[PDB]
């Protein structure tokens, strides 16, 4: 502890102004490993030790320790909490796939009220954490919890499966509307896995890269998207000449394009060989068009991606892994 | 059962000749290469499943709502997503056209998920791969030329 600063450590400065080559440092790094395994004293095989420990509570007793009493101090390291709470989310995960798969009937099951459950539990903890924050404006601490994106989108889901689960209890109707909710809800609870994933040292990085690689992506989508809605429109209005406006305009345009690329390329479903049907006329151009078409966005542009993946991966590798540490 | 066992060993015994091919120069390298990439893309492989799983469960969620408890089930989450990523994307079997049948509640989001589902998996995470075995290979030729001599 500093006297003359404030009551705070030097690791607290060092964060404080966001330096980053002071935390990555290897002392550091020692010290918060140091701090994380909390009391224990197991060093070359852990975790594993961790889950027979916390599934068998006689395992705690044949552990070393450091300088009745025993199991309040393995209780409280933060290893053994955050694998407590890596098992729950875990049961947590296996209910909600559990009642989406099953039918579900008029009232909810006993796993479904477990989940319920989970959720607002975890609702309840979220806006603890919002209320005990350190700034003494209640507008201020909103907006500095909504600095991740993480506490933003777990914000976004409870909303969404409250209004699910609100719509729900009731009638048929709105009950398979709930359900629906229900089946698009469970897909952002399987992806956020990878924040228990980014506690592992190889993993980590990876998922910060793939967070780059994304805004690096974004711009290729648009190329391609602006190729394959001309292809997919000169075909529309080569093959079929004679329709009312419809909104099915809309999805013939985007869908057969888009399906071509990821190997469902059809010579039957498209330029059909036109006993014989009647022929459209300037309908020979259809092969030409995708011919053009495949060539561009299979061989040129996926390259040219590759390249700019391969060309700027050590310096987000570096970064990501100074971020992570 | 004998001739299942027997198909079993065989498929380690053909697997087993990477051994012999390990003498001659340009063989051998190869192999302990392959052996570290395999260690590096299983870490690819786990995130890959996690997604596909996600897009089964959401899947099969939403187009069957009426199904019976059963091990059937625990079957479509993997099946089909794993052979759409390689080549087999046919969508007459996903999404079918609901004379035409009854559409179910919520069953045009299934195309939407497909391309996020597509673009994540063969744009994104596989050129990632790409990258990784590109930019770590000339420390791994230089170690596994070393162990082999
Ligand atoms: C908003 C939730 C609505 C739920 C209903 C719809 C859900 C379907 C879409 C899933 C959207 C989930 C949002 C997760 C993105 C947040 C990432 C983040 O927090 O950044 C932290 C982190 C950086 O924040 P920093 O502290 O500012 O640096 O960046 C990452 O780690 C990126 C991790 C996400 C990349 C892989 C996941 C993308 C998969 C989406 C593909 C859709 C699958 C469909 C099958
Ligand atoms: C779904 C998982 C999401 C949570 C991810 C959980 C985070 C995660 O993936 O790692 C935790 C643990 C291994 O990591 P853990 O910290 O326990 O132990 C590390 C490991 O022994 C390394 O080999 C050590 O050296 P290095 O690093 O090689 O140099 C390292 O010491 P150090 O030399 O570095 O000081 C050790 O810290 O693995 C499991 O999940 C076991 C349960 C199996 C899974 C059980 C379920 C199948
Ligand atoms: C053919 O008739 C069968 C019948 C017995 C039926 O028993 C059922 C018991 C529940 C059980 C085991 C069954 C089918 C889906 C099973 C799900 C698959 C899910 O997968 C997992 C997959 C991976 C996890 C990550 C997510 O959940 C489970 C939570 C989930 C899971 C294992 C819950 C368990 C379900 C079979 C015969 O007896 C008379
Ligand atoms: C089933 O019967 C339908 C009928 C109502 C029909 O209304 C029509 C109004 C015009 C509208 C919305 C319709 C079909 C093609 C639609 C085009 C698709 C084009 O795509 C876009 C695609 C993307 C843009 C970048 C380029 O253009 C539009 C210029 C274009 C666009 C959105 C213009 C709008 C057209 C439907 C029901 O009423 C009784």
């Given at each position: 502890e500093l006297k003359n600063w404030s009551n705070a450590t030097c690791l607290q400065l060092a964060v404080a102004a966001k330096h980053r080559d002071f935390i990555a440092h290897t002392c550091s790094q020692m010290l918060l490993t140091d701090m994380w395994m909390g009391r224990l004293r197991m060093?070359?095989?852990?975790?594993?030790?961790?889950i027979l420990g916390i599934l068998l509570p006689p395992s705690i007793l044949s552990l070393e320790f450091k300088n009745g009493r025993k199991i309040y101090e393995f209780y409280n390291a933060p290893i053994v909490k955050f694998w407590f709470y890596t098992l729950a989310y875990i049961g947590y995960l296996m209910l909600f796939n559990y009642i989406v798969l099953v039918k579900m009937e008029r009232w909810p099951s006993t796993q479904e009220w477990?989940?319920?459950?989970?959720?607002?539990?975890?609702?309840?903890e979220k806006m603890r954490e919002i209320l005990m924050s350190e700034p003494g404006k209640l507008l201020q601490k909103v907006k500095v919890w909504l600095q991740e994106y993480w506490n933003v989108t777990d914000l976004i889901a409870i909303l969404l499966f409250s209004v699910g689960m609100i719509l729900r209890?009731?009638?048929?109707?709105?009950?398979?509307?709930?359900?629906?909710?229900?089946?698009?809800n469970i897909i952002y609870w399987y992806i956020r896995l990878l924040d228990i994933f980014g506690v592992?040292?190889?993993?980590?990085?990876?998922?910060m890269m793939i967070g780059k690689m994304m805004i690096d992506m974004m711009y290729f989508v648009i190329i391609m998207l602006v190729v394959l809605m001309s292809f997919g429109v000169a075909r529309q209005a080569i093959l079929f000449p004679n329709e009312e406006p419809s909104w099915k305009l809309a999805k013939n345009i985007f869908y057969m394009p888009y399906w071509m690329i990821y190997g469902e390329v059809?010579?039957?479903?498209?330029?059909?060989?036109?006993?014989?049907?009647?022929?459209?006329?300037g309908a020979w151009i259809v092969p030409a068009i995708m011919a053009c078409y495949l060539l561009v966005a299979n061989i040129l542009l996926v390259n040219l991606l590759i390249a700019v993946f391969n060309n700027t991966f050590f310096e987000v590798k570096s970064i990501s892994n100074q971020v992570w540490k």
């Open positions: 060093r070359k095989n852990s975790g594993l030790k961790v477990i989940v319920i459950s989970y959720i607002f539990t975890l609702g309840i209890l009731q009638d048929q109707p709105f009950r398979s509307d709930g359900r629906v909710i229900y089946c698009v592992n040292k190889y993993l980590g990085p990876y998922v059809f010579a039957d479903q498209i330029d059909p060989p036109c006993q014989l049907p009647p022929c459209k006329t």
